[PDB]
């Protein structure tokens, strides 16, 4: 895969070897195929289809490597893992993997070794996925969602509590298959395989009420730290919920071309359109550090950052943007 990266880079988390913030896509080079890219506050990891995990950036909380004397992984380097990796997620200063044996491991947050998180899971080969943001992780298998970490806004369960070290069952649909969990810094939205919202919890952004948003099928839900975005491909719209102090509400001016992909970082969004074949990638929201393009004033609207001959995959981090071809 060909990977481009830009935005915040004070800890060399863009994998470019230098520590300068960048405002246009830069080729970042670890023939491995990228499964996905996950981002924490100041570290980045790339998982390839072969099961290898590579990372770069801050290691002062044990995000990437067991050597306490290693403060930062300056360039892309393999992450030592207990077994081949099938899925990965990051939190603020943490990295969590699902391995090929179906075991879940966490490092970071001051812990320098991968430690097993004992999630109740079946050994029947039902897909096991992990999602993470800020100080929470969830693990999904079948109809069940387990989670751990902060609970100060009742995102995992009620009543509030500072932190839950051991996994708790957040939701069991008792029926429909869960597709994924979209996570904000202190809230989450559970989506089924039909694109319907089945549950939501925590400090939900202003204007979003679970019971008013469970009607429509075929949605895609994305979350920034403090906002929810609902992409409706049938109508070619993105509906946003949040305060929008820094242009995070998706711009409502009519798009002339179909949206074929959406991703979010901490406080920005990344949009891909098909202009048929040519694909355009745009950013909206908070872009002080260059993660939305060269216009860094967080002005509203979609800012074009790249054009590609094939359909890209996009990923967002903490004021970082990733484009994978």
Partner 1 sequence: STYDEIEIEDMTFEPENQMFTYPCPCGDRFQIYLDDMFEGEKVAVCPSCSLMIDVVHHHH
Q: Which residues here bind partner 1, judged by CB under 8 A?
A: 8, 10-11, 13, 41-42, 92, 134, 152, 185, 225-226, 243, 245-246, 265-267, 286, 288-289, 318-319
- Residue 255 contacts Cl ion per CB under 5 A: yes
Nearer to partner 1, 196 or 268 (CB): 268
- Sorted by sequence, the CB contacts under 8 Å of residue 244 that are 6+ apart come out as 227
The rounded distance, in Å, linking the Cα atoms of 253 and 256 is 9
Q: Give the CA angle between residues 118, 121, 123 to the nearest 5°.
A: 120
**Is 101 a binder of Cl ion (CB under 5 A)?**
no
- Determine if 143 is a binding residue for Cl ion (CB under 5 A): no
CB contact at 8 A, 7 and 28: no
Q: What are the Cα distances from residue 292, in Å, to 29, 262, 268?
A: 21, 14, 7
Look at residue 210 and give its three-state secondary structure: helix
Per-residue buried b or exposed e for 152-187, using 16+ beta carbons within 10 Å of the residue's own CB: ebebbeeeeeeeeeebeebbeeeeeebbbbbbbbbb
* Spacing of C-alpha 11 from chain mean position: 19
Q: Shortest gap between Cβ of 138 and partner 1 (angstroms)? A: 19
User: Is residue 152 a contact residue for Cl ion (CB under 5 A)?
Assistant: no
Which range, of 24-32, 167-175, 235-243, 315-323, touches Cl ion by CB under 5 A?
24-32
The reply to whether 304 sits near Cl ion by the rule CB under 5 A is: yes
Distance in angstroms (rounded) separating the CA atoms of residues 228 and 184:
8
Q: Whose Cβ is closer to partner 1: residue 39's or residue 259's?
A: 39
What is the closest distance, in whole angstroms, from the C-beta atom of residue 128 to Cl ion in the complex? Answer: 17
Q: Residue 116 interacts with Cl ion (CB under 5 A)?
A: yes
How many chain residues touch Cl ion (CB under 5 A)? Answer: 13
Cβ-based nearer residue to Cl ion, 116 or 214: 116
Q: Please, what is the minimum distance in Å from the beta carbon of residue 76 to partner 1? A: 18
Question: Can you give the C-alpha Rg of the chain in angstroms?
Answer: 19
Helix (H) or strand (E) holding 129: strand 128-133
User: Taking CB under 5 A as the rule, does residue 257 contact Cl ion?
Assistant: yes
Least Cα distance to 15 among 33, 32, 37, 35 occurs for 37
CB atoms within 10 A of CB 253: 9
Binding at 246: pick from partner 1, Cl ion, none (beta carbon under 5-8 Å per type): partner 1
Which distant-in-sequence residues (6+ apart) come within 8 Å of 135 by Cβ?
Answer: 91, 92, 149, 150, 163, 185
Residue from the set 50, 80, 193, 209 that interacts with Cl ion by CB under 5 A: 50
Question: Which residues pair with residue 263 across a beta bridge?
Answer: 270
Q: How far is the CB of 133 from Cl ion (least distance, A)?
A: 12
Decide if residue 33 touches Cl ion (CB under 5 A): yes
Residue 185 or 196: the one with the smaller Cβ distance to partner 1 is 185
Nearer to partner 1, 90 or 198 (CB): 90
Residues 6+ apart with CB under 8 A from 236: 255, 258, 259
Nearer to partner 1, 66 or 152 (CB): 152
Q: Which stretch binds Cl ion (CB under 5 A): 2-10, 12-20, 191-199, 295-303?
A: 295-303
> By CB under 5 A, is residue 78 in contact with Cl ion?
no
216: partner contacted, choices Cl ion, partner 1, none (Cβ within 5-8 A by kind): none
Nearer to partner 1 (CB atom), residue 147 or residue 316: 316
Q: Which of 183, 207, 178 is nearest to 195 (CA)?
A: 178
Q: Which residues bind Cl ion (CB under 5 A)?
A: 32-33, 48-50, 115-116, 255-257, 296, 303-304
């Amino acid at each position: 895969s060909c990977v481009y990266a830009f935005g915040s880079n004070g800890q060399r988390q863009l994998g470019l070897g230098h520590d300068e913030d960048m405002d246009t896509p830069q080729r970042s080079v670890p023939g491995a195929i990228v499964r996905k890219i996950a981002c924490g506050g100041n570290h980045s990891v790339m998982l390839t289809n072969d099961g290898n995990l590579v990372g770069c950036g801050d290691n002062r909380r044990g995000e990437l490597d067991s050597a306490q004397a290693l403060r930062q992984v300056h360039d892309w380097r393999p992450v030592e893992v207990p077994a081949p990796v099938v899925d990965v997620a990051c939190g603020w200063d943490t990295t969590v993997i699902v391995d090929a044996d179906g075991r879940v491991w966490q490092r970071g947050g001051g812990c320098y070794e991968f430690t097993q998180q004992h999630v109740p899971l079946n050994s029947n080969d039902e897909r096991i996925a992990v999602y993470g943001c800020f100080q929470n992780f969830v693990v999904v298998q079948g109809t069940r969602v387990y989670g751990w970490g902060s609970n100060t806004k009742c995102q995992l369960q009620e009543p509030k509590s500072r932190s839950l070290k051991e996994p708790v069952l957040v939701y069991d649909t008792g029926s429909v298959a869960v597709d994924y969990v979209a996570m904000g810094k202190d809230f989450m939205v559970i989506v089924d395989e039909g694109g319907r919202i089945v549950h939501a919890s925590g400090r939900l952004p202003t204007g979003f009420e679970l019971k008013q948003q469970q009607k429509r099928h075929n949605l895609v839900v994305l979350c920034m730290w403090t906002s929810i975005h609902l992409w409706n491909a049938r109508l070619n719209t993105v509906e946003s919920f949040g305060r929008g102090t820094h242009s995070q509400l998706f711009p409502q001016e009519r798009l002339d071309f179909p949206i074929v992909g959406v991703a979010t970082g901490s406080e920005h969004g990344i949009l891909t359109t098909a202009n048929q074949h040519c694909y355009n990638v745009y950013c909206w929201g908070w872009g002080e550090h260059g993660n939305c393009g060269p216009q860094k004033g967080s002005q509203p609207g979609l800012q074009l950052v790249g054009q590609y001959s094939g359909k890209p995959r996009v990923f967002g981090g903490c004021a970082t943007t990733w484009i994978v071809l």
